[PDB]
From Swiss-Prot, chains A, B:
PROSITE patterns: NUDIX, NUDIX_BOX. Gene3D superfamilies: Nucleoside Triphosphate Pyrophosphohydrolase. Changing residue 65 to Q: Increases Km for GDP-mannose 80-fold. Reduces activity 24-fold. Belongs to the Nudix hydrolase family. Substrate binds at residues 3-4, 9, 37. Coiled coil: none annotated. This is GDP-mannose mannosyl hydrolase. Keywords: Hydrolase, Lipopolysaccharide biosynthesis, Magnesium, Metal-binding. Homodimer. The gene is gmm. HAMAP family: GDPMH_gmm (MF_00941). Mg(2+) binds at residues 50, 70, 123.
Length: 160, 160
């Protein structure tokens, strides 16, 4: 557990990869959860929910913290199916356009009931449940979220 | 690609997880490579070779840089069998005992010919090739290296 003050978060983002968990969440209709991001990077794009692991935080603890923060429902890591190690590179950062952000991302897939989520408004100003076909066809869904649904992008992803 | 100044590496290690690749390296007789570490963390322990991924460095590029740096032989990531995601927590760091180090680690296994390595002396002052049974019985092999030969404090799948 360590949420960093902004100065040290800036130095971290400038200097090293972030490590994060992305949640590929399915409902009862075979559709997947995307939120319209309010923060950089990938600001304004539809994206799966996800976030970074903190210093000295286990993956197990991060999964609980992040599902609760992103989805409004605390789930244990055993609820998730590990879905590979991905790499996301952005030209901007949480607080500006002056340096890049790099994430190494652990994907997890799971199915939920919509009524058990309490979707928060901090990181997204709208949410939708999209079919694979629809999300792949939309250039407003960021490429790094579309990639989870493309066979060609899964090739050579460690863990798949 | 970004090798950090010590000042920046210290801020990074204090503040966030490192992401690294560890190499489970087999020879033609089924033994595995361990080096006797000269740097913190895990200083003085026998450990598999491995190291961290830098800012804006792909896993593919890191794998080539790190195999060359650790083994003296450059191999592509396609040569490696993904061997799980692991989490390693140390009470010390490269610079001393003032803060902890946290790694999220991707394991990769592959076989080499001993005669094709050029084992470097920067990070290890000796190297041995041990059977799985032998290294598991040796307490001078760090617990975090022994874990690759059991069992699972492991996230995800061995490839294949
Ligand atoms: N100051 C500060 N902000 C953080 C830290 N970690 C994440 N954030 C920010 O908190 C918000 C949510 O974090 P997260 O879901 O991990 O980021 P995401 O990659 O933008 O979805 C974003 O605006 C992040 O930039 C941190 O340790 N310190
Ligand atoms: N100054 C500096 N040292 C680094 C950096 N990355 C790794 N090191 C050090 O370089 C050496 C080899 O790095 P690596 O194999 O990644 O780390 P290991 O976990 O100690 O095997 C170790 O002494 C590390 O502490 C960095 O960006 N800057
Ligand atoms: Cl050999
Ligand atoms: Mg997030
Ligand atoms: Mg190393």
């Amino acid at each position: 557990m360590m949420f960093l003050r902004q100065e040290d978060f800036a130095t971290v983002v400038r200097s090293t990869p972030l490590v994060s968990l992305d949640f590929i969440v399915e409902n009862s209709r075979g559709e997947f959860l995307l939120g319209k991001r309010t923060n950089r990077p990938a600001q304004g794009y539809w994206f799966v929910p996800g976030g970074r692991v903190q210093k000295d935080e286990t993956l197990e603890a991060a999964f609980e913290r992040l599902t609760m923060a992103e989805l409004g429902l605390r789930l244990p890591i055993t609820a998730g199916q590990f879905y590979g190690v991905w790499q996301h590179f952005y030209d901007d950062n949480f607080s500006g356009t002056d340096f890049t952000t790099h994430y190494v991302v652990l994907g997890f897939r799971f199915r939920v009931s919509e009524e058990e989520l309490l979707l928060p408004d901090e990181q997204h100003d709208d949410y939708r449940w999209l079919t694979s076909d629809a999300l792949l066809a939309s250039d407003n869904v960021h490429a790094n979220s579309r990639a989870y649904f493309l066979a060609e992008k899964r090739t050579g992803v460690p863990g798949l």
